[PDB]
Protein: ATP-binding protein
Amino acid sequence: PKLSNGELVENRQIYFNEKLEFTSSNTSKATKASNGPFNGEFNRFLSRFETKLTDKRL
Amino acid sequence: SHIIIFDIHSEYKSAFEIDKNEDFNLNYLDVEKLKLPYWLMNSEELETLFIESNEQNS
Structure:
């Protein structure tokens, strides 16, 4: 995984500490970035889950 | 006395519309007079209102 600021991620564990912004997608040979296996598939899941987190009657 | 009525194909307007001299104020909220701010809306309903699916959503 590549960060937005030209940085690669060695261990997939800095995710837990904070939210990170990644580089956009492109098909150029010199600058090639591809969508992740789980990219965009948790949209409704994230919406419902954040809705659960925000409410505090619970 | 507190009664609230959710009536598709409104029919009970005449049942309570007695003469004005009897002092029975009835507030008739018809589609013209409803004031429902869209910004009081949760996740699911905002997505449903401003989003369709139809094709495979890009």
Chain B touches chain A at residues 42-43, 47 (CB under 8 Å).
